[PDB]
Amino acid sequence: VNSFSGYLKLTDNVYIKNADIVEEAKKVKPTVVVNAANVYLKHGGGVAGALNKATNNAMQVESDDYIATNGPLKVGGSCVLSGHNLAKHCLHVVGPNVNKGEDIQLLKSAYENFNQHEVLLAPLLSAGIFGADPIHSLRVCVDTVRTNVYLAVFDKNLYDKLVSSFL
Numbered sequence: 001v002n003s004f005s006g007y008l009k010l011t012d013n014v015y016i017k018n019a020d021i022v023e024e025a026k027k028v029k030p031t032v033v034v035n036a037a038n039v040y041l042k043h044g045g046g047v048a049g050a051l052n053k054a055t056n057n058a059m060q061v062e063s064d065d066y067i068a069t070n071g072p073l074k075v076g077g078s079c080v081l082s083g084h085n086l087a088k089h090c091l092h093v094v095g096p097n098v099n100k101g102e103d104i105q106l107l108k109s110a111y112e113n114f115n116q117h118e119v120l121l122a123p124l125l126s127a128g129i130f131g132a133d134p135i136h137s138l139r140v141c142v143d144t145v146r147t148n149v150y151l152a153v154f155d156k157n158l159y160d161k162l163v164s165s166f167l
């Protein structure tokens with residue numbers, strides 16, 4: 001039993017809710033919140049910009065030190081950093097950004113990072129400003145993640161379409 005509330009159950013391990021991931025994180029304080037990161041951990045917009053804003057830019061400061069030490073992530077890769085005031089940990093996961101021409105096949109690799117964590121709050125990878133079809137992102141999620149994932153979908157109209165079209 002965990003403290004996630006109001007989710008629709010899609011499968012054995014995947015749950016979905018129309019919610020602002022920032023407000024969800026501030027309520028639940030999960031062990032892991034997933035950020036929709038880019039390889040430079042530049043949290044300018046989308047989910048990343050919103051999560052960083054909620055940390056008062058502390059996520060960006062920590063991220064800049066990480067990059068200065070380690071260099072950029074790989075597309076499809078991840079790193080674990082602090083969750084600041086939102087969660088214990090933030091798993092920064094880089095899905096492909098279609099608006100950069102990145103290979104959508106790397107989306108499965110991106111979701112594989114979730115399997116290293118027993119429970120996660122997460123957005124749909126490569127959705128929103130990353131330019132992939134969110135229906136496809138959901139299918140890959142369900143077919144790749146085996147740990148317990150609670151998906152927050154900010155857009156209510158998008159949330160309704162994802163549920164109704166789910167196979």
Ligand SMILES: NC(=O)[C@@]1(O)CCN(c2ncnc3[nH]ccc23)C1
Nearest residue numbers: 020021022045046047050053128154
């Ligand atoms: N005032 C705010 O910060 C927002 O209400 C608008 C920006 N922000 C988000 N921007 C993009 N993608 C997102 N996914 C989940 C939340 C979210 C929250």
Ligand SMILES: [Cl-]
Nearest residue numbers: 036046047128
């Ligand atoms: Cl985003």
